[PDB]
Structure 1
Amino acid sequence: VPGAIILDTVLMLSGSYLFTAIVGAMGWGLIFYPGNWPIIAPLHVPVEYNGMLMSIADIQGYNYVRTAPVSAFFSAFMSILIYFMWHFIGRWFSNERFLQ
């Protein structure tokens, strides 16, 4: 949600799509991890599990059997080209033609 709010509001104030694509997508990218941090953090407490350091989260995946903010910046920088490319993709899905 946090991100989508940033996107929605940034486009609303100063109704320029180009503006949203740059700082709007910027925000969407950046905010994401800090946006999850309150949920995630408790899962990263260190445990010595049978002689090995592991975070709770690790132990969880280990137990329940299935079968570094440069990362943030990257993702923001990238979202821009994606917001952008998809702004135009959306022009097409808005298209109102008829055929024959």
Structure 2
Amino acid sequence: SAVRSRAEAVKVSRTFDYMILFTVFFVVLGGYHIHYMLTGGDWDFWTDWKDRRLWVTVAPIVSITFPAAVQAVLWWRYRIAWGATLCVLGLLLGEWINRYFNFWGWTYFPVNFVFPSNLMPGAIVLDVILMLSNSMTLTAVVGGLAWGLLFYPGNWPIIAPLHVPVEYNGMMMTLADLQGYHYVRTGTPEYIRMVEKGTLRTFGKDVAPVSAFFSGFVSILIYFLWHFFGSWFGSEKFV
């Protein structure tokens, strides 16, 4: 009406988009990273914590929170297909910057000891399952199961080389245990390590799959809850 042309509005929209994307990316990055790194991230810090029972159970559960909340308005307000991908990209960028410039660059822990978990697969499948079927409950169920089940398979090719057994001074240890043993963590004694230790009610080899199915089932409810939580965060109410 007083700008210049109708193509000027297209350029004004484009510039606004770049700003809005920047701010959302980084604010959600901050929030997501703090939530993750303070609910399920000790398993994320060290390779010798990436076990078959507690890692596979906790990582996806607490990880699916922000993707679902951000998706509750970046889909029914602007039909935005990404939003879980954006959450995960932010989380991974923050984690990698910290690992490389502080964990390694500051305290000198080797990078092959502190690399982050991989949450890209589940994110893409969740975004797609939502784009198609345009359903929150359908997405809840199916994408939650997928998120829960795609985690360990998505990470195995990365941590497999470190699970080769080794005999060290008479005891048997994996290369990941050997790493945890060599590189001293004065603040992280060995006994706090919450990893699978075997029980009388446990079976010989059934931890990884059972923990991925339990995690998927719980991710169903987590996505359900955080969908509504995010719908609330999208409120425009004034007080």
User: Which TM-score tier does this pair reach, normalised by the shorter chain?
Assistant: over 0.9
TM-score, with length taken from structure 2: 0.41
RMSD: 0.5
Residues 1:89 and 2:229 are matched in the alignment:
yes
TM-score, with length taken from structure 1: 0.97
Distance 1:64 1:87 in 2: 41
> What is the identity percentage for the equivalent residue pairs of Structure 1 and Structure 2?
72
| Selected match of 2:220 from 80, 83, 89 | 80
Cα distance per residue 1:14-48 (max 9 Å; x no partner): 11010110011110010000100010100100000
Q: 2:170 corresponds to which residue?
A: 51
Distance 1:22 1:52 in 2: 44
**Aligned residues, how many?**
99
Q: 1:62 corresponds to which residue?
A: 181
Structure 1 ranges of 4+ moved more than 3 A: none
Q: Secondary structure at the match of 2:172?
A: strand
Cα distance per residue 1:44-91 (max 9 Å; x no partner): 000001101100000000000002110000000000000001010001
5+ residue gaps, structure 1, are none
Amino acid in structure 2 at the alignment position of 1:82: I
Distance 1:50 1:20 in 2: 51
Distance 2:178 2:131 in 1: 44
Distance 2:220 2:132 in 1: 18
Q: Secondary structure at the match of 1:65?
A: coil
5+ residue gaps, structure 2, are 1-119, 187-206
| Selected match of 1:4 from 111, 115, 123 | 123
Q: CA deviation at 1:98?
A: 1.1
